[PDB]
A paper describes a structure:
Multiple strategies have been developed to modify monoclonal antibodies, including chemical conjugation and protein engineering. Recently, we identified a cyclic, 12-amino-acid peptide that binds in a cavity formed by all four IgG domains of the cetuximab Fab. Based on our observations, the peptide–Fab interaction does not affect antigen binding. Herein, multiple crystal structures of meditope peptide derivatives incorporating natural and unnatural amino acids bound to the cetuximab Fab domain are presented.
Superposition of the F3H complex onto the cQFD complex, however, suggested that it may be possible to increase the affinity by introducing a β-branched, unnatural amino acid containing a phenyl group. Owing to its commercial availability, we incorporated diphenylalanine at position 3. Given this, every substitution at position F3 significantly increased the off-rate (e.g. nearly tenfold) except for diphenylalanine. Despite the absence of a gain in binding affinity, the alternate rotamer observed for the histidine substitution at position 3 motivated the diphenylalanine substitution, which increased the lifetime of the interaction. We speculate that the affinity could be further improved using a β-branched amino acid in which the exposed phenyl group is hydrophilic and capable of making hydrogen bonds to the Fab.
Numbering used by the authors:
A (entry chain E): 1 to 12
B (entry chain A): 1 to 213
C (entry chain B): 1 to 133, 139 to 221
Write the structure that this text describes.
């Protein structure tokens, strides 16, 4: 997926 | 460098169930693997070190096994606070390297969103921009549709959505849909509606307001 | 208790340098090494290097050229500096400490420093009220038009946390970020309690307290 800088969470 | 492959990419489980995360190494790394938890907006939290050794302050439902190339992180009874990403780390070989993580999602019962609409403030109107915000609060599952209408005209391309990650307590999501228009456009129209569609609603729910009322 | 606190989040011009201070307490830099790790969209978790108790440094292979770590034991500070940032150097940078002085099992982390590599200018946000109007009222703040991420929002100086949702920031076409933060409260408490969102955008030193009231 993506690693999202805003949330520090995997965003799939 | 050692390559660490974590599977699956997403795990979805119900509270109280057991759950396992796989970390696989490109060559044998003995038991030199560490595990981390990352919560929303968090720094990593060390859960298990050296494949199986416990860490102070980490709840006992966390445990790990494995040796060689195939490793397992286990939670014997999942709680809502476990909603997070999980990463493994090897340090048998320099440099220490991390896997790419597994996302832990929690299943729960359907909850219909509570819907709220917010007109633009008069403060913002002074800047010549108008933001109309629509809030869908505490729902499950994550899928939802927001449809904007201004004076019965379907709005398209002028809205953006943001969805929170799962709540650590009730496992719900919340969503904000922001409709952005120029002050000029905003003043030329009267009825602003956002229509919300969700599995837990038997009909779509509309919240609306008339400008200056 | 062991803590590591990093300097504030910020913007770095492309081809320019990144400096972060890690200030530690609860232990001495003469006894433990301090590691640096980043988390990028391109490469996830990536170990950068370490300054050991005795002042020696190791740097991960692709960083030997552009990375420098130093420290001041007395002041309990670790100094991280990386040259020549490109766009894909945008990441969260963390300092970290292991359980045992020589090891790499990271039990203690800094809070992370979000670093944006961009040519754009810093810009503080405007804060607008989301005014309230079955006994539960919703209210909030629209935090609009800032760069770069992040912004912090809390409610009533930390006192109000229950029922707070602070949405992930979204990037508008203008290249500026926007965000809302909401909270649900008893409608009977709107004539009694004050509701304030405390907004802090560190990269622009913009701090705003926005009182949010029912519209008249
Ligand atoms: C950034 O760009 C360089 C040059 O293409 C590449 O070698 C490096 O791996 C990239 N780093 C990332 C994605 O963090």
């Amino acid at each position: 997926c993506q690693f999202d800088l805003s949330t520090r969470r995997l965003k799939c | 460098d050692i390559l660490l492959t974590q599977s699956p990419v997403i795990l979805s489980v119900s509270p109280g169930e057991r759950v396992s995360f796989s970390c696989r190494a490109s060559q044998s790394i003995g038991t030199n693997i560490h595990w981390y938890q990352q919560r929303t907006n968090g720094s990593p939290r060390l859960l298990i070190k050296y494949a199986s050794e416990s860490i102070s302050g980490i709840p006992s439902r966390f445990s790990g096994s494995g040796s060689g190339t195939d490793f397992t992180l286990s939670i014997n009874s999942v709680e809502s606070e476990d909603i997070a990403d999980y990463y493994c780390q090897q340090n048998n070989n320099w440099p220490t390297t991390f896997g790419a993580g597994t996302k832990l999602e929690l299943k729960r019962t359907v909850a219909a969103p509570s819907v709220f609409i917010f007109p633009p403030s008069d403060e913002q109107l002074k800047s010549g921009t108008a933001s109309v915000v629509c809030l869908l609060n505490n729902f499950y599952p994550r899928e939802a549709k927001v449809q904007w209408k201004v004076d019965n005209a379907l709005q398209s391309g002028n809205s953006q959505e943001s969805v929170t990650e799962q709540d650590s307590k009730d496992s719900t999501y919340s969503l904000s849909s922001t409709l952005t228009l120029s002050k000029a456009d905003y003043e030329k129209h009267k009825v602003y509606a956002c229509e919300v569609t969700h599995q837990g609603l038997s009909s779509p729910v509309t919240k609306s307001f008339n400008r200056g009322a | 208790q062991v803590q590591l606190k990093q300097s504030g989040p910020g913007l770095v011009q492309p081809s320019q340098s990144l400096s972060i201070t890690c200030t530690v307490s609860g232990f001495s830099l003469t006894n433990y090494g301090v590691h640096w790790v980043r988390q990028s969209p391109g490469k996830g978790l990536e170990w950068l290097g370490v300054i050991w108790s005795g002042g020696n440094t190791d740097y991960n292979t692709p960083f030997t050229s552009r990375l420098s770590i130093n420290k001041d034991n007395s002041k309990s500070q670790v100094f991280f500096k990386m040259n020549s940032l490109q766009s894909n150097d945008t990441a969260i940078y963390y300092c970290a400490r292991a359980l045992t002085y020589y090891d790499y099992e990271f039990a203690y982390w800094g809070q992370g420093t979000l670093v944006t590599v961009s040519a754009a200018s810093t810009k503080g946000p405007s804060v607008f009220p989301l005014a309230p109007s079955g006994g539960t009222a919703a209210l909030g703040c629209l935090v609009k038009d800032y760069f770069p991420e992040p912004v912090t929002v809390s409610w009533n100086s930390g006192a109000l946390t229950s029922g707070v949702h602070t949405f992930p920031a979204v990037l508008q076409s203008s290249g500026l970020y926007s965000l809302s933060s909401v909270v649900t409260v008893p409608s009977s408490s709107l004539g009694t309690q004050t509701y304030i969102c405390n907004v802090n955008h560190k990269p622009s030193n913009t701090k705003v307290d926005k009182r949010v009231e029912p519209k008249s």
